Design an enzyme around this catalytic site. Structure first.
Site, PDB file in Angstrom:
ATOM      1  NE  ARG A  66      -6.851  16.433  23.754  1.00  0.00           N
ATOM      2  CZ  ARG A  66      -6.785  15.234  24.332  1.00  0.00           C
ATOM      3  NH1 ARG A  66      -7.551  14.239  23.898  1.00  0.00           N
ATOM      4  NH2 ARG A  66      -5.961  15.029  25.352  1.00  0.00           N
ATOM      5  CB  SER A 118      -3.774  13.343  27.759  1.00  0.00           C
ATOM      6  OG  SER A 118      -5.109  13.711  28.063  1.00  0.00           O
ATOM      7  CE1 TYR A 119      -3.761  18.975  34.457  1.00  0.00           C
ATOM      8  CE2 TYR A 119      -3.223  17.293  36.072  1.00  0.00           C
ATOM      9  CZ  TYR A 119      -3.352  18.633  35.723  1.00  0.00           C
ATOM     10  OH  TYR A 119      -3.071  19.639  36.624  1.00  0.00           O
ATOM     11  CG  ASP A 137     -13.870   8.393  33.329  1.00  0.00           C
ATOM     12  OD1 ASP A 137     -14.982   8.885  33.047  1.00  0.00           O
ATOM     13  OD2 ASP A 137     -13.177   7.778  32.485  1.00  0.00           O
ATOM     14  CE  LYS A 179      -3.465  -2.762   2.284  1.00  0.00           C
ATOM     15  NZ  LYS A 179      -4.657  -2.398   1.480  1.00  0.00           N
ATOM     16  CB  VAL A 204     -10.622  15.122  34.310  1.00  0.00           C
ATOM     17  CG1 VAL A 204      -9.676  15.179  35.507  1.00  0.00           C
ATOM     18  CG2 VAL A 204     -10.669  16.460  33.540  1.00  0.00           C
TER      19      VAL A 204
HETATM   20 MG   LIG Z   1      -8.319  10.389  30.211  1.00  0.00          MG
HETATM   21 NA    NA Z   2     -11.610   8.823  31.002  1.00  0.00          NA
END
Ligand SMILES: [Mg+2]
Ligand code: NA
Ligand code: NA
Ligand code: NA
Length: 310
Positions: free
Chosen positions: A136, A167-168, A235, A62, A178
Site C-alpha cells: 500500500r 480508501s483515499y 485506475d 465454530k 488510486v
Molecule cells: Mg481503490
Molecule cells: Na482500483
DNA sequence: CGGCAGTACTG
DNA sequence: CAGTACC
DNA sequence: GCCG
C-alpha cells in the site's frame, strides 16, 4: 475487536474457501468476521453467537469450539494447495480458475510460473509487479498520483473534474491503488479524452504498463519520478456528469458498504449501481445530482466518505 | 430453494 | 462465452 | 456460509 481469538482463526478458513473458488461460503465467513469484530464484547455463549446477524448455526458452533479448546479442528484439514493457490491468485489477472489450473499442471512457485506457465499480457504485468502490487502506498503518494492525472486532464480541458476515490477518499492513511474518477459538468466534454490523456501521461514516463484500455475504464500502472519509488496501481474512470454522484459513491466504497446499500435498495424496490439509483421489477433512473440524494432517496441519513469504511 | 450486484474488458 | 476485475 |  474483542474477538480476535475467533477472528484470526476464521480468516484462515475464509481465505481458504476464497482461493479455492467457493466465493459464497467465503462471503459468509467475511460477513461473520466483520460482525464478530464490531460487536461490543467478547462472545461467551452459543446463543450469544446466534444473537449477532451474520452468525448462524454452523458458525455459532465454530466459535463454541474456539471458546473451549482454544483451537478449531477444521483448520488442520485445509488442503496443502491453499498457500500456493493464494500465491498464484495474487498475480493481477489470475483468479481462482487460473490458479487451480496452474496447480493441477504441477506449478508450485512463482519461479515455476515465470519459467513454464503461459501468461496473458495482463498476468505478465502482474507477475512483473508482484511485490509492488501487494504494498500500500502512503496517502500523500496517492495525492501526488491524483494531482498528476488532474493536471494532465485539466491541460486538455480545464473544466474536467478529477477525484481520487477508494480508501483515499475514505480518509485512510494508506491506499492499495488510486481510483481517479473524471467527469465534466457540460455532460459532453468527458467523451473520448483517453486518446489525449493517456498519451500525455505516457509522454511523462508516468504510465509504465496498461492492464485494461477501454472506452470508459483505464486500469494500469504508474510510477512517480525520483529515487525510491514503487510502481502503483492506477485506475481512471470517465463518467457522464449525470452519473457522477453514483460513481463517486460506488468507487468510494467500501465494497462491504456498497453491498449493504444494494441490499437496502432491494428492500425498497430499487437498484443501485455505479451508474444510477433506479426502480426495478427496464426501470426508471432516479435523479441523483449528489451523493446526498442517493441516501435521501433510500430513506437513509447521509454518511460522509470516512464512515463508509466497512 | 436460492440470492447474496451489475458492468466493463480480454481473448 | 468464461474468467477477472472494479468498489 | 447466512438468511428469508
Ligand atoms: Mg481503490
Ligand atoms: Na482500483
Ligand atoms: Na444471527
Ligand atoms: Na489475481
Amino acid at each position: 475487536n474483542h474477538n480476535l481469538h475467533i477472528t484470526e482463526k476464521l480468516e484462515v478458513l475464509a481465505k481458504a474457501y476464497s482461493v479455492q473458488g467457493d466465493k459464497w461460503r467465503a462471503l459468509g465467513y467475511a460477513k461473520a468476521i466483520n460482525a464478530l469484530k464490531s460487536f461490543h464484547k467478547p462472545v461467551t455463549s452459543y446463543q450469544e453467537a446466534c444473537s449477532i446477524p451474520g452468525i448462524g448455526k454452523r458458525m455459532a458452533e465454530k466459535i463454541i469450539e474456539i471458546l473451549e479448546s482454544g483451537h478449531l479442528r477444521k483448520l488442520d484439514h485445509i488442503s496443502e494447495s491453499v498457500p500456493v493457490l493464494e500465491l498464484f491468485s495474487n498475480i493481477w489477472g489470475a483468479g481462482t480458475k487460473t490458479a487451480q489450473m496452474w496447480y493441477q499442471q504441477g506449478f508450485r512457485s512463482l519461479e515455476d510460473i515465470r519459467s513454464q506457465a503461459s501468461l496473458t499480457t495482463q498476468q505478465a504485468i502482474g507477475l512483473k509487479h508482484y511485490s509492488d502490487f501487494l504494498e500500500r502506498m502512503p496517502r500523500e503518494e496517492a495525492t501526488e498520483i491524483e494531482q498528476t492525472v488532474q493536471k494532465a486532464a485539466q491541460a486538455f480541458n480545464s473544466g474536467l473534474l478529477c477525484v481520487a476515490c477508494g480508501s483515499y477518499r475514505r480518509g485512510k492513511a494508506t491506499c492499495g491503488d488510486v481510483d481517479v474518477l473524471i467527469t465534466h459538468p457540460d455532460g459532453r466534454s468527458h467523451r473520448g479524452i483517453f486518446s489525449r490523456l493517456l498519451d500525455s501521461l505516457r509522454q511523462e514516463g508516468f504510465l509504465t504498463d496498461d492492464l485494461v484500455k477501454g472506452e470508459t475504464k483505464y486500469l494500469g500502472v504508474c510510477r512517480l519520478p525520483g529515487p525510491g519509488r514503487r510502481h502503483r496501481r492506477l485506475d481512471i474512470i470517465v463518467v457522464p456528469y449525470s452519473e457522477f454522484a453514483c460513481a463517486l459513491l460506488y468507487f468510494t466504497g467500501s465494497a462491504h458498504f456498497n453491498r449493504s446499500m444494494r441490499a437496502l435498495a432491494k428492500t425498497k424496490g430499487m437498484s443501485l449501481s455505479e451508474h444510477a439509483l433506479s426502480t426495478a421489477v427496464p426501470g426508471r433512473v432516479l435523479p441523483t445530482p449528489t451523493e446526498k440524494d442517493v441516501f435521501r432517496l433510500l430513506g437513509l441519513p447521509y454518511r460522509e466518505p470516512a464512515e463508509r469504511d466497512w
